[PDB]
C-alpha cells in the first residue's frame, strides 16, 4: 500500500 515517491530525476 505504502510506496515511496522516488522518481529517477536527472540527466
Amino acid at each position, epitope marked *: 500500500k505504502l510506496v515511496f*515517491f522516488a*522518481p529517477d*530525476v*536527472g*540527466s
Partner: antibody
Amino acid sequence: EVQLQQSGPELVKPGASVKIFCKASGYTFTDYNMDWVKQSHGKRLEWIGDINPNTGVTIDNPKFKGKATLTVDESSSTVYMELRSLSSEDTAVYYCARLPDNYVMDYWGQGTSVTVSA
Amino acid sequence: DVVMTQTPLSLPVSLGDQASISCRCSQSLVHRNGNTNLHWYLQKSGQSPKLLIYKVSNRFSGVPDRFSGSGSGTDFTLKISRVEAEDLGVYFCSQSTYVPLTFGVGTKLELKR
C-alpha cells in the same frame, strides 16, 4: 531566474478533452522533473503526477488515471497534460511545478484555469 | 493516501503577533533516503503557491528568518515570529514521502479587527 509559464484559460464542453502546456526557462530543463497540481473550489490541492523530461516516464496519482495524461517535448522545454471526458468536477485551476532531485516542488507556474460548460 | 490535518483552519492575528500552524499526518513521513519530506507552502490571493519551508525546518531561498518549522514523525508546526502584512494568506503543509503527494486543507492567516 526560474520561470514556469503555463497556457491560457480553457473553455471546454462536457465530455470533451483539452491539452494544456507549461514552458520552462531559467535553468537546465533536463536536470529537473515537472509535476502537476489541481486546485478546485475551497482551494484544496491535489497532486496529479510527475514526469521525467529525458524519458517521459511518469509517476501518476491513481485517482487521475482516467483523467490526466502527462507528456513532454524537451526540445521546446514544454510539458503537457491532457484532461479527457471533462465534467463539472474538472472545473479548476491546474498548476505546473518544478521537482528537483530533492523531491520537493519548489517553483510553480501561474496556473491554468479550465472551465467546463456546454 | 497520507492524510494531512491542519489546525487551525482560520488563524486571526494582529500584526506583530506570533503564529503557530499545526500539521498532523496519518503515518510517519521518513523517506527511505532518510529525509522527512514535509514542506510548507504559502498562497496569497490571486497568486500561485510558494515554497516557504521544505523538509521540516529548511527555509527556502528568500524566505525571512521570521519563518521556522519543526516536528518529526506525524506532528509538525510552522511558526512565525512577528506576523507581517505580507505574511497573510493560506498556508498548506504537504508531504512528498509517499505516492500520491498530499496537501493539507489549508490555514488562512487573516488580520484581526
